[PDB]
Ligand binder design. Structure first.
Ligand code: HEM
Ligand code: HEM
Ligand SMILES: CNCCN(C)c1cncc(CCc2cc(C)cc(N)n2)c1
Ligand SMILES: CNCCN(C)c1cncc(CCc2cc(C)cc(N)n2)c1
Ligand SMILES: C[C@H](O)[C@H](O)[C@H]1CNc2nc(N)[nH]c(=O)c2N1
Ligand SMILES: C[C@H](O)[C@H](O)[C@H]1CNc2nc(N)[nH]c(=O)c2N1
Ligand SMILES: [Zn+2]
Lengths: 407, 411
């Protein structure tokens, strides 16, 4: 019941007490581990509020204070009368930071306390949403010196008035099915692209077209907006040694900004809460560029390098992989757009993890997601035992709105 | 109950029913996943159901379930258990059992080969000298002049836990590690403790970087005894690189035969505490882990220096670049010397086919994603994108305590 995690590289052992505050289910049982599975009322509401407010007031060394009791009382009143309650600005900021802190699949959590929270709870229309998102994008981008941010739209009420950003990220490239049977652009975005066209977007049918935002306010029908092109910072990809690399015509956007997740704080649900940080190189170079079901460029790069692609054992894929990832990091650095390599990031996460165990009694971490998609065992996280469990406040997955939306 | 797994690269969905036969625990609960945790004397009471479960499976597998032969065998074992407190497996059951322990090994990417396993029955062995002989024969047969063959040698099962057969080595063939007074390590740091035990037991250490350890063999609960595997039986491969001529001068080699010797084989409730097994290497085991772990030979820097990579910032990915060249070298060297080896692309691709075949024919394939995914180039191998279900089936291979912590010394 008091769990130990061992680092097999360093022999360092940490004791986890924090997991006993866990609440949501893991998908696992004593008979079966689902660790590798990607997606495993007033009565209900007040204990959630209380649990949250208890931890909030503990964090400000005011547990059991009158102001603590007062707040608890006030919230209980409000839930009883109005069936929901409103978070204080302080509570909202605390909650959003802790959702990030609790994100077990995020390697970048050493940064968790430095998050800029934009309160967009006063937003009522999709136009309003668009303005808030432009401001987020511009703030977070900061001319390439990226700053973590989250913009938080009105909370769920009855479920029939949800705010939703239909896009999975604020910034992504379109994907088009060709008559050639092939796929043009990002294959991961074909369906959403269709919905944009369906909703009237005039697609330029290019390879790196920035998708428009599809914004839904107050449970109304979603509307289309185009992010001002001058606010979308992009990095052309070149290689420091290979002059030919630029001829691939590759580029990527600077701002990773997740927009389809649900923020839960104190039992309240924020269905529209886009958040952003900065990229770890492998996200672009390994996954976005080299996944078979993505831009899938390995072969083309390999050919340009004149590798023996006859036999897997020449490790031509591994060689091209490295070079592609070298180019990504080099291109971002050259353009002064913030980026972190997988060595630096995983090293930071180890130190964060030690800080968290020391100051919080633990740190929930999903090893399957934390270990980078290349060079796994030469990063310190590979040798680090981790315990995965769910703490709230939290970011959750939610269904794509087009399967949900009564038009 | 039905469980589905999805491959996120291909969208192929498989349905697992085999997990319904799962037995032992995972370490996980509804509240906590311990999927990345490395390490999560028996009464007649518990024994017969375990025997029975096993024999029902064996008899189903040979399409003789419910047969008189099946029924007589259950009867025979039941009686032998109530008479003698244990029972002996038929040779057929032992072989079936050993193959299935491998088949069930959720951490093994090489399981496409599971039905091809040479089983050496050493249950008649009584002494450490006898164990040495059996192990030499296993090594010679398995090595096969570089054309490696999978094999397992099975020594007598546990009785009261006071007469265990144990191979004290973690692998049949491994290199000594020596801690120096200046705190540096000569040879393989992983094997420092065991090397020290060998030396204390009388082993004369050459004290070089690649000294093959002696066997430390325990028969029938007696104190273990030292034996040197005949050098001519230990196949090794000098590591060179197809393009970089300086790579040979790193002075690296490795042995050809990976042979785990510290695990416990459970079959029908019986416990085989000494059951060394061997196959052939996947390149990354050597090129990534053995050579490049900071806690092992740790050669990344020396290699990267010689390639003259920019080592001033990790962002140059000098470690990644050197890592690849080393793994190219391992594969090159083994192939050149005609010693069996498989790259991580081939091995993971074969595993996916095996896994799918298993779902279709067996109703599932327990697999530990954390172990299955190779330690380099994870997501450009198909296993990375494959959801897996980890559970425990018997017969199985299990961890056991290192014998030096538990052995009662006779003296
Ligand atoms: C500031 C630098 C950051 C870095 C380097 C970073 C890094 C990463 C990486 C590599 C992943 C795996 C993503 C994937 O493979 O798709 C991830 C996931 C995640 N991150 Fe972070 N992140 C950062 C900031 C943030 C922020 C600001 C938040 C929230 C406020 C956040 C919350 C999450 C969540 C919830 C996931 C899981 C996503 C999912 O399950 O799909 N991250 N992060
Ligand atoms: C024939 C070629 C084989 C290949 C290429 C192969 C591949 C692998 C690899 C790469 C690992 C991970 C090792 C590590 O990271 O320490 C492993 C583990 C394992 N293998 Fe296989 N293997 C083979 C044969 C066998 C055989 C013959 C058996 C048993 C009869 C077996 C049973 C196991 C078990 C029980 C593990 C888990 C080891 C542990 O938990 O420490 N394998 N295998
Ligand atoms: C299963 N993933 C497919 C969709 N995808 C590529 C994706 C999913 N989930 C999250 C992200 C972005 C991850 C991320 C987020 C933030 C804030 C920073 C960062 N460096 N990466 C991307
Ligand atoms: C605890 N981890 C380090 C111990 N170690 C190096 C190790 C552990 N477990 C297994 C092996 C050898 C793995 C193996 C076994 C067999 C039969 C074939 C193969 N290719 N690899 C080595
Ligand atoms: C902590 C973590 O479980 C540990 O480093 C594991 C990860 N996956 C592994 N996978 C294999 N094949 N072999 C290993 O030793 C490990 N080590
Ligand atoms: C099946 C498996 O869970 C899936 O491929 C996971 C593996 N680990 C991952 N890790 C990260 N960071 N991101 C991912 O999308 C995935 N995909
Ligand atoms: Zn689990």
């Amino acid at each position: 019941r008091f769990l130990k995690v061992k680092n097999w590289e360093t022999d360092v052992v940490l004791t986890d007490t924090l997991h006993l505050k866990s609440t949501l289910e893991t998908g696992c049982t004593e008979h079966i581990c689902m660790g590798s599975i990607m997606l495993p009322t007033k009565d209900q509401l007040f204990p959630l509020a209380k649990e949250f407010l208890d931890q909030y007031y503990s964090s400000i060394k005011r547990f059991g204070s009158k102001a603590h009791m007062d707040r608890l009382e006030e919230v209980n009143k409000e839930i009883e009368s109005t069936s929901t309650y409103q978070l204080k600005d302080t509570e909202l900021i605390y909650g959003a930071k802790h959702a990030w802190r609790n994100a077990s699949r995020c390697v970048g959590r050493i940064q968790w306390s430095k998050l800029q929270v934009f309160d967009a709870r006063d937003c009522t229309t999709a136009h309003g949403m668009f303005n808030y998102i432009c401001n987020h994008v511009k703030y977070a981008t900061n001319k390439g010196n990226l700053r973590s941010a989250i913009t938080i739209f009105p909370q769920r009420t009855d479920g029939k008035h949800d705010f939703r950003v239909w896009n999975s990220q604020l910034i992504r490239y379109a994907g088009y099915k060709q008559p050639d049977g092939s796929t043009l652009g990002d294959p991961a975005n074909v369906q959403f692209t269709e919905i944009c066209i369906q909703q009237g977007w005039k697609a330029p049918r290019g390879r790196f077209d920035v998708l428009p935002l599809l914004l839904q306010a107050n449970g109304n029908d979603p509307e289309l907006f185009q992010i001002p092109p001058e606010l979308v910072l992009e990095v052309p990809i070149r290689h420091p040694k290979f002059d030919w690399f630029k001829d691939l015509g590759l580029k990527w956007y600077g701002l990773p900004a997740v927009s389809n997740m649900l923020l839960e704080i104190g039992g309240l649900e924020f269905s529209a809460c886009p958040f952003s940080g900065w990229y770890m190189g492998t996200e672009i170079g390994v996954r976005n560029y080299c996944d078979n079901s993505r831009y899938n460029i390995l072969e083309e790069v390999a050919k340009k390098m004149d590798l023996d692609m006859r036999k897997t054992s020449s490790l031509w894929k591994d060689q091209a992989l490295v070079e592609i990832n070298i180019a990504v990091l080099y291109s971002f650095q050259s353009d002064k757009v913030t980026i972190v390599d997988h060595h630096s990031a995983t090293e930071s996460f180890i130190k964060h993890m030690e800080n968290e165990y020391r100051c919080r009694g633990g740190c929930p971490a999903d090893w399957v997601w934390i270990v980078p998609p290349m060079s796994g065992s030469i990063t310190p996280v590979f040798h680090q035992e981790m315990l995965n469990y769910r703490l709230t406040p939290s970011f959750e997955y939610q269904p794509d709105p087009w399967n949900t939306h009564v038009w």
